[PDB]
RNA sequence: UACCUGGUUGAUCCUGCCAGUAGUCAUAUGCUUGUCUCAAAGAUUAAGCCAUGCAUGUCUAAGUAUAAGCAAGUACUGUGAAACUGCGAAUGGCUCAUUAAAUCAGUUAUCGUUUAUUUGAUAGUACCUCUACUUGGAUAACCGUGGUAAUUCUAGAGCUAAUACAUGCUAAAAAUCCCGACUUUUUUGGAAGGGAUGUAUUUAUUAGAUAAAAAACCAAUGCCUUCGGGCUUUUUUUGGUGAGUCAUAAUAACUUUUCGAAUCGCAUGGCCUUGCGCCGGCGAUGGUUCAUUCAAAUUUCUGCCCUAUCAACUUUCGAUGGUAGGAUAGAGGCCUACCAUGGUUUUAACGGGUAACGGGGAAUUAGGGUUCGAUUCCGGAGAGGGAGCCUGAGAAACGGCUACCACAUCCAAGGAAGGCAGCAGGCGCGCAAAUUACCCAAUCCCGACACGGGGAGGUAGUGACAAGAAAUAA
RNA sequence: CUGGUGCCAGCAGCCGCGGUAAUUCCAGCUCCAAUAGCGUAUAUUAAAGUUGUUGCAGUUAAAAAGCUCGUAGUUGAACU
RNA sequence: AACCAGGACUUUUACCUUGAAAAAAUUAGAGUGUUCAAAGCAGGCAAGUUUUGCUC
RNA sequence: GUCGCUACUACCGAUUGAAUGGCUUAGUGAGGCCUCUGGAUUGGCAUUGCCGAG
């Protein structure tokens, strides 16, 4: 199989190292797991030491977080917007680490409505008292309002699906959101 | 070359046959070998044809239809013997065992009838060790709580002084 | 290569085992356990080569299956169990309660003790951390872990675990005037009293120890072992007390031995 | 060499596992001490760069050997070449000979490094093929 | 163990080499031979080719008995062929082909990694808002019976078992967070009753103060005094490392939901509603996590023969570095996309040769040095040359498999099948090197384990030589 | 020393002996050295101060570039 | 201000001394009746009791 | 010093030089592996769509 030694690599001084060993099993590699968008496709590979790695080729209903309130929920991944290095990876629609994706915000709207009560972009005494006690921090970014109006949100995955079998991330916000939006404004 | 249910090729072919499919016996674990086998369809190259009876005809063949074999072995498990003898819930299951004769065994006098063993019958030996295991669990919990209380006293003294 | 080794040849065996070079080709090859194979004595070596309670490898196995070697109060059956430093061997069919301690020259020797003082096993701690459920746990040099230890104990300290009844009953700190034995090195097996601790950046604390005769020497923190304080060694010392009896004085001792018969 | 805008790459250069919320304004910056008697430079405490492979405000750790040598080449990006010189022993002739070996160490934007300007480097885990050292202390000729 | 001599000339003194001289498990051969102790014996070319036998097997009362035997209590009750199951087979042993900062030697790091077994800790929590607590099916052997000339030749046909495989309540009680029937300030208004709340994965965030010591404001709100509003020794989590985002605790979600026992053998102890009901011991085998150990994998510095009639080498198709990703158990241009042109070198880079495995070490010995080191110890490589892969913690394993290349073999001409640089023995190359022997008794290894096995290993047969003692006299 | 050949056979590590008196050729006698061992062929080491840092030699025996500049390299006055 | 005690203390090396950790065998070499020796790591007491020990 | 005869040593050389082994160019490509498919057969559900697998 594919090897990861430096014996085949040319030395730092320019000399080419001759063959010394046959390919060993403590240095083996494996094929990439380009997990495109589709119905959940996860299998198992027995890695060295008896452990198991969960691969991924298609993933649905991933996990994404919201750090302002510290709430994470399962959401359905729609599509991939940007990915650094080769941009052709976006065209072939593969999910990897550090690649922004588009997500739905219907569960976020439902949780926000059932928590704060006061609807964004317009009896029950205990509910009203809770709303009054938790009113004041309901303000959100203008970008966070436009995404709710448009029904789609930008999220960044912070997990490797080819290693752990999950595509987990967080909602993009702040200066990173501004940088990414200004990066993709001339492209879209 | 033996049979192979699945291969549609109308002649013998070779494949990296695995122990999961029939016509193999592993010499050691993780062993796969290349062997030749025939297809799943029938041609003119066959010499012995294996067939099964579905429904008997009007006439009876004297050699096979008349002759029948008896079932010389019976149930072993508690569920198997219960379904074999259709006994009630409390019917002394130990009294429904099959007894054989040992006249050819050259026993001479008083032929010692031999019967198989019955499995999965409730015996108080297993319950004793199960209770002991639960005993060990409760002893572990009580010891954990006792040493936790001792360390709680130690931590209370330390935070006090 | 391709996996672990199960055969240890002789001559390559540790020198302090004092195994005969002839009469065989291979060494006992201590099995994995609580002590490193380079710093442990196999049970067969201790019972046969060091104690002569059985000859050749066969009779020693017979008594081990006979369930008589209650090491640390429990009977084991491994003929090559890695019995490390400060181990107790209690043969209750005979009454002996042997102790495993370094001698003056740095080799294991017979340290038979009474029934008392053979229950608690003095052990150095390795590190202190926090375990599951927010609780502290301690790990010793003999591969033994203690749950809920004394909060006043730090690394490179001493405990006296009771064994069988278990649990730490007493602990000893690491500071000046404490009696310290050297576990390994070129100053093997000699107790003194730590007087100076020299700090070196990164690692390699240097411990200066003064013996009974006030001759002075130095060792490493990873190789020291605190047993007692200002002449209050809670454990018994073997013959010679581990001072540093040199060759020039051992010659006089041998001459005096000759001038006795 | 020349410090540019930190967000001048395809990916947003960011300090991992640091977040800004409404309660805590702006983005806090985290720093650590490498140890072994060294001190964290002030501009590393208050700078702009990220430098994931830096002993400060980064992830690499300092452990192992500590060497000293003169940097010869700075033309490459964020790393340099250290030239260590020593005298070899010939038992036969009872004399010395000059022997040199070129190192390969990583330089943070925290240190302004040019030719000459002997520095001190320390082991910082393999970084790129032949880079296993990082510059920690610089005894500059200007100061 | 600081040593010489003969040879140029008619004769002399030098330079100079030749020769004599002495040593070497350093090799062979020639002549000769009555004994013991001790140690080695196909490396030098053919890491060339092999008929034949062996070298890896393993069971306690305690994983399965219906022996389809046996010697002698109506589920069996003693032996047990036969097999499945678990483990080892990655340890030993052989050889030195390849290998020139490669191996190896000394010295560091893994705060950049994995690990079967051993040791020590770890588990009143699984399901219902009607759940088995004891439960599914297949799977050997036996049994008739078939094809191939022989196969480690199997399927066809009846089944029966698992500490194999696949499911499945167990244990309370207390407490916590959410959904909310309800009133009447009886705080900031919380709880009747319903659910998750053990353990394990990933994601984000908070606390992670602690070298010590005073105040001005805002929010939810823990003790509420004596409702002015106070607000503390502490509930603010805590500890450790030279050094961290380290260990641990709290918050919000996910898991084709990991573990949390459907197993065996002996002591028949004690009870009263007397059911033949309750309860009580000594062991063994598995299983989650952590530490440790046995190992492995990278990795810092320094040290390698000859060659300039090799002076420039490396970047195409990775050569030097940055970002991001993939892969790996793990760092890393190991790989991929983009961005820069970099790195070494007269202190000899690079290329080539080596009749070069490296070292501990051996021979000679004033000292300095020179030569050798396949070989009883350590590390590396190989099992005809490559390449790929399953199993297994650990192999790119060859007494594991697969395909090509060069060989050998039975063929009925349809096919089948291998690897002694293992122990013996055969052919050939050869100046050059041994038995187709006995044994697990000693050293140790493997396994379910006092009981089995081990061409590892011990012993012996053969010699002219490797060292030590001495017949042929008196 | 005694017999056979007579630049022939041959001996012989080098010098070297043999053309009718051969202490060096082949036969006998005896003697010398080691000893159950001795010789021969090859590799290597000491001698080799003929590899020389210790520790060579360069006018005539082998050996100072025809001469000069010049960078690596080597060596570098005294004084704290 | 200033003083004493402990720790750090070479701007930066080369050099010299000592210590640490460091495989054994092998080399030198200490002890020791394989009849000496190549060896090996044991071994010894103790003639008048035989002692179910001591000593290295 | 040229010419000699011989045993033997070395060099160049037409033959667009031959015969092995590494280093590379171009073409093709066995083999195992990862992945996309395919559901004889096992099928619980006169019935008939759904859990499924080698």
Swiss-Prot record, chain A:
Lineage: superkingdom: Eukaryota
Keyword Phosphoprotein recorded:
yes
List where Basic residues composition bias occurs: 123-133
Known InterPro entries for this protein? Ribosomal_eS8, Ribosomal_eS8_CS, Ribosomal_protein_eS8_euk, Ribosomal_Se8/biogenesis_NSA2
Q: Sorted alphabetically, which keywords does the UniProt record give?
A: Cytoplasm, Phosphoprotein, Ribonucleoprotein, Ribosomal protein
Q: In this chain, where does the modification Phosphoserine occur? A: 61, 98, 138, 142, 159
- Region annotated Disordered sits at 1-40
Matching Pfam families? Ribosomal_S8e
Q: Which GO terms describe its biological process?
A: cytoplasmic translation; cytoplasmic translational elongation; maturation of SSU-rRNA from tricistronic rRNA transcript (SSU-rRNA, 5.8S rRNA, LSU-rRNA)
Molecular functions per Gene Ontology: structural constituent of ribosome
Q: Quick one: a GO cellular component term?
A: cytosolic small ribosomal subunit
| Subcellular location as annotated | Cytoplasm
Task: Name the family.
Answer: Belongs to the eukaryotic ribosomal protein eS8 family.
Recite the other comments. There are 2 genes for eS8 in S.pombe.
Described function? Component of the ribosome, a large ribonucleoprotein complex responsible for the synthesis of proteins in the cell. The small ribosomal subunit (SSU) binds messenger RNAs (mRNAs) and translates the encoded message by selecting cognate aminoacyl-transfer RNA (tRNA) molecules. The large subunit (LSU) contains the ribosomal catalytic site termed the peptidyl transferase center (PTC), which catalyzes the formation of peptide bonds, thereby polymerizing the amino acids delivered by tRNAs into a polypeptide chain.
Q: What is this protein called?
A: Small ribosomal subunit protein eS8B
Species assigned in the record: Schizosaccharomyces pombe (strain 972 / ATCC 24843)
Upper lineage is: Eukaryota, Fungi, Dikarya, Ascomycota, Taphrinomycotina
UniProtKB/Swiss-Prot annotation, chain B:
Q: What does this protein do?
A: Component of the ribosome, a large ribonucleoprotein complex responsible for the synthesis of proteins in the cell. The small ribosomal subunit (SSU) binds messenger RNAs (mRNAs) and translates the encoded message by selecting cognate aminoacyl-transfer RNA (tRNA) molecules. The large subunit (LSU) contains the ribosomal catalytic site termed the peptidyl transferase center (PTC), which catalyzes the formation of peptide bonds, thereby polymerizing the amino acids delivered by tRNAs into a polypeptide chain.
Provide the Gene Ontology terms for cellular component.
cytosol; cytosolic small ribosomal subunit
> In its UniProt entry, what is this protein called?
Small ribosomal subunit protein eS6B
Keyword terms: Cytoplasm, Phosphoprotein, Ribonucleoprotein, Ribosomal protein
Task: Give the source species.
Answer: Schizosaccharomyces pombe (strain 972 / ATCC 24843)
Give the signal peptide range.
none
Binding partners and assembly: Component of the small ribosomal subunit (SSU). Mature yeast ribosomes consist of a small (40S) and a large (60S) subunit. The 40S small subunit contains 1 molecule of ribosomal RNA (18S rRNA) and at least 33 different proteins. The large 60S subunit contains 3 rRNA molecules (25S, 5.8S and 5S rRNA) and at least 46 different proteins. Interacts with snoRNA U3. uS11 interacts with MPP10. Component of the ribosomal small subunit (SSU) processome composed of at least 40 protein subunits and snoRNA U3.
Question: Phosphoserine is carried by which residues?
Answer: 88
Q: Which GO terms describe its molecular function?
A: structural constituent of ribosome
Swiss-Prot record, chain C:
- Its domain of life? Eukaryota
Please name the Pfam families in this protein's record: 40S_S4_C, KOW, Ribosomal_S4e, RS4NT
Tell me where in or outside the cell this protein is found.
Cytoplasm
> What's a GO biological-process term for it?
cytoplasmic translation
What's one GO MF term for it? rRNA binding
Q: Which GO terms describe its cellular component?
A: cytosol; cytosolic small ribosomal subunit
Main location per UniProt? cytoplasm
Q: Which residues form the S4 RNA-binding domain?
A: 41-104
Q: Which residues carry this modification: Phosphothreonine?
A: 193
Keywords for this entry?
A: Cytoplasm, Phosphoprotein, Ribonucleoprotein, Ribosomal protein, RNA-binding, rRNA-binding
| Family designation | Belongs to the eukaryotic ribosomal protein eS4 family.
Q: Give the free-text miscellaneous remark of the entry.
A: There are 3 genes for eS4 in S.pombe.
The record's listing under HAMAP family reads:
Ribosomal_eS4 (MF_00485)
The free-text function statement in the UniProt record for this protein reads: Component of the ribosome, a large ribonucleoprotein complex responsible for the synthesis of proteins in the cell. The small ribosomal subunit (SSU) binds messenger RNAs (mRNAs) and translates the encoded message by selecting cognate aminoacyl-transfer RNA (tRNA) molecules. The large subunit (LSU) contains the ribosomal catalytic site termed the peptidyl transferase center (PTC), which catalyzes the formation of peptide bonds, thereby polymerizing the amino acids delivered by tRNAs into a polypeptide chain.
Subunit structure, briefly? Component of the small ribosomal subunit (SSU). Mature yeast ribosomes consist of a small (40S) and a large (60S) subunit. The 40S small subunit contains 1 molecule of ribosomal RNA (18S rRNA) and at least 33 different proteins. The large 60S subunit contains 3 rRNA molecules (25S, 5.8S and 5S rRNA) and at least 46 different proteins.
Protein name, entry field:
Small ribosomal subunit protein eS4C
Curated annotation (Swiss-Prot), chain D:
PROSITE patterns in the cross-refs: RIBOSOMAL_S17
One Gene Ontology cellular component term attached to this UniProt record is: nucleus
- What biological-process GO terms show up in the record? cytoplasmic translation; ribosome biogenesis
What is the annotated localization of this protein?
Cytoplasm; Nucleus
Q: Which SUPFAM superfamilies match?
A: Nucleic acid-binding proteins
Q: Which Pfam families match?
A: Ribosomal_S17, Ribosomal_S17_N
Q: Which residues form a coiled coil?
A: none
Any GO molecular function: rRNA binding
What the record says about family reads: Belongs to the universal ribosomal protein uS17 family.
Miscellaneous comment as given in the Swiss-Prot or TrEMBL entry:
There are 2 genes for uS17 in S.pombe.
Question: What's the protein name?
Answer: Small ribosomal subunit protein uS17A
Q: Which organism is it from?
A: Schizosaccharomyces pombe (strain 972 / ATCC 24843) (Fission yeast)
């Amino acid at each position: 199989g594919i090897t990861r030694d430096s014996r085949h690599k040319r030395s730092a001084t320019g000399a080419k190292r001759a063959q010394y060993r046959k390919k060993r099993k403590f240095e083996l590699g494996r094929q990439p797991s380009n997990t495109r968008i589709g119905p959940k496709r996860i299998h198992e590979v027995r890695v060295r030491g008896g452990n198991k790695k969960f691969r991924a080729l298609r993933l649905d209903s991933g996990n994404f977080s919201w750090g302002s309130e510290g709430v994470s929920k399962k959401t359905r991944i729609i599509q991939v917007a940007y990915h650094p290095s080769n941009n052709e990876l976006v065209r072939t629609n593969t999910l990897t680490k550090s690649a922004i994706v588009q997500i739905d915000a219907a569960p976020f709207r439902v949780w926000y409505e059932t928590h704060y009560g006061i609807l964004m972009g317009s009896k029950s005494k205990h509910v009203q008292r809770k709303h009054s006690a938790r009113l004041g921090d309901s303000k959100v970014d203008s970008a966070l309002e436009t995404q709710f109006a448009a029904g789609r949100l930008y999220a960044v995955v912070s997990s490797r699906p080819g290693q752990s079998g999950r595509c987990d991330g967080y909602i993009l916000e702040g200066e990173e959101l501004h940088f990414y939006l200004r990066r993709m404004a001339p492209k879209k | 070359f033996p049979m192979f249910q699945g291969v549609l090729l109308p002649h013998r072919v070779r494949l990296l046959l695995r122990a999961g499919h029939p016509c193999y016996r592993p010499r050691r674990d993780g062993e796969r070998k290349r062997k030749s086998v025939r297809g799943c369809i029938v041609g003119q190259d066959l010499a012995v044809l294996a067939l099964a009876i579905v429904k008997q005809g009007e006439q009876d063949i004297p050699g096979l239809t008349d002759v029948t074999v008896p079932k010389r072995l019976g149930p072993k498990r508690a569920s198997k013997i219960r379904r074999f003898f259709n006994l009630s819930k409390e019917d002394d299951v130990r009294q429904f065992v099959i007894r054989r004769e040992v006249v050819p065994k050259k026993e001479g006098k008083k032929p010692y009838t031999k019967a198989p063993k019955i499995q999965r019958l409730v015996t108080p030996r297993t319950l004793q060790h199960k209770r002991h295991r639960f005993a060990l669990k409760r002893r572990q919990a009580e010891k954990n709580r006792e040493e936790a209380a001792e360390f709680a006293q130690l931590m209370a003294k330390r935070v006090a002084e | 290569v391709r996996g672990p080794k199960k055969h240890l040849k002789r001559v390559a065996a540790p020198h302090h085992w004092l195994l005969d070079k002839l009469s065989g080709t291979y060494a006992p090859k201590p099995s994995p356990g609580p002590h490193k194979a380079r710093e442990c004595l196999p049970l067969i070596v201790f019972l046969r080569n060091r104690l002569k309670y059985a000859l050749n490898g066969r009779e020693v196995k017979a008594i081990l299956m006979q369930r008589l070697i209650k090491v640390d109060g429990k009977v084991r059956t491994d003929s090559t169990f890695p019995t490390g430093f400060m181990d107790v061997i209690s043969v209750d069919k005979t009454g002996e309660h042997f102790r495993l301690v370094y001698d003056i020259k740095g080799r294991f020797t017979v340290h038979r003790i009474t029934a008392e003082e053979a229950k608690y096993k003095l052990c150095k701690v390795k590190r202190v951390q926090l375990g599951a459920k927010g609780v502290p746990f301690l790990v010793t040099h003999d591969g033994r872990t203690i749950r809920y230890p004394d909060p006043l104990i730090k690394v490179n300290d001493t405990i006296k675990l009771n064994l069988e009844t278990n649990k730490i009953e007493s602990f000893i700190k690491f500071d000046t005037s404490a009696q310290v034995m050297v576990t390994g090195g070129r100053n093997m097996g000699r107790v003194g009293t730590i007087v100076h601790r020299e700090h070196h950046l990164g690692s390699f604390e240097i411990i200066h120890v003064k013996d009974a005769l006030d001759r002075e020497f130095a060792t490493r923190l990873s190789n020291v072992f605190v047993i007692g304080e200002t002449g209050k060694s809670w454990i018994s010392l073997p013959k010679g007390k581990g001072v540093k009896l040199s060759i020039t004085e051992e010659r006089d001792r041998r001459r005096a031995l000759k001038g006795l018969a | 060499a020349t410090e540019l805008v930190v967000q001048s790459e395809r990916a947003f250069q960011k300090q991992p596992h640091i977040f800004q919320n409404a309660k805590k304004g702006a983005g806090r910056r985290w720093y650590k001490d490498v140890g072994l008697g060294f001190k964290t430079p002030a501009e590393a405490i208050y700078g702009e760069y990220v430098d994931k492979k830096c002993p400060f405000v980064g992830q690499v750790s300092i452990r192992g050997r500590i060497l000293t040598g003169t940097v010869v080449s700075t033309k490459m990006h964020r790393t340099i070449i250290i030239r260590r010189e020593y005298l070899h022993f010939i038992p036969k002739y009872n004399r010395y000979e000059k022997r040199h070996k070129n190192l390969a160490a990583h330089v943070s934007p925290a240190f302004r490094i040019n030719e000459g300007d002997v520095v001190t480097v320390g082991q910082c885990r393999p970084l790129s093929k032949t880079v296993r050292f990082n510059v920690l202390r610089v005894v500059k000729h200007t100061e």
